Amino acid sequence: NLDMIKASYITMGYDKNAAEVGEIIKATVKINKITNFSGYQVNIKYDPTVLQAVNPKTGVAYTNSSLPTSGELLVSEDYGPIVQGVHKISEGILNLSRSYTALEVYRASESPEETGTLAVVGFKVLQKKATTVVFEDSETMPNGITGTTLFNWYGNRIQSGYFVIQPGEINSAP
Predict the structure, then answer these.
(1) How many CA atoms lie within 13 A of 129 on its CB side?
(2) Kind of pairing, strands 9-14 and 163-165?
(3) How many independent structural domains does the chain possess?
(4) Which of 11, 32, 58, 152 makes a 20 to 30 Å CA pair with 38?
(5) The domain that contains 12 carries what CATH number?
(6) 150 vs 59: CA distance, rounded Å
(7) Residue 89 phi/psi, 5° resolution?
(8) Within 10 A of 151 (CB to CB), how many other CB atoms are there?
(9) Closest by alpha carbon to 92, among 131, 58, 142, 144?
């Protein structure tokens, strides 16, 4: 299962599938063909006993309020992006949101951002043990599509029409 694909989705990709205790894998949240996309909320589940959420480009441990590192999308300052992280690190739960707020300015450009990366998080290996990270619904995302909510530039929730592609195993027991 690889990308280069016509269907609309959101996924997570790894820069590597395998790593030693203490090494960091960068996990990138990214989307494909989301119509008039203007923001995301995602809820991420991982094994805290096995993986530690860190900054991907420094290595410093995330707190319950750490920000994701930015992607290619949602960084145009003219459209007023706001970003927030509300985590439960001891349960292995990250919840990240970033949206444009100046939607009228955005709509006026007639140039929607529909495909690209959204967010980069780091995962430092604490045990070289078989482990998976998932998008997963939360009690707090009543409307979450498998732990995801995406919006368009009218401020509407995208209610269907895309796939949530789970990222696949880390350090798989061969």
Answers:
(1) 9
(2) parallel
(3) 1
(4) 58
(5) 2.60.40.680
(6) 28
(7) -60, -30
(8) 20
(9) 131
Q: Which residues pair with 74 in a beta bridge?
A: none
Radius of gyration, CA atoms only, the chain: 16
At 99, give phi and psi (nearest 5°): -140, 150
- Structure tokens, 114: 């529909």
Question: CB–CB of 67/88 below 8 Å?
Answer: no
Best CA proximity match to 85, nearest among 101, 66, 71, 61 = 66
Assign 3-class secondary structure to the chain.
CCCCCCCCEEEEEECCCCCCCCCEEEEEEEEECCCCEEEEEEEEECCCCCEEEECCCCCCECCCCCCCEECCCCCCHHHCEEEEECCECCCCEEEEEEEECCHHHHHHHCCCCCCEEEEEEEEEECCCCCECCEECCCCCCCCCCCCEEEEECCCCECCCCCEEECCCCECCCC
Q: For 94, phi and psi rounded to 5 degrees? A: -115, 140
| Domain extent at residue 25 | 1-174
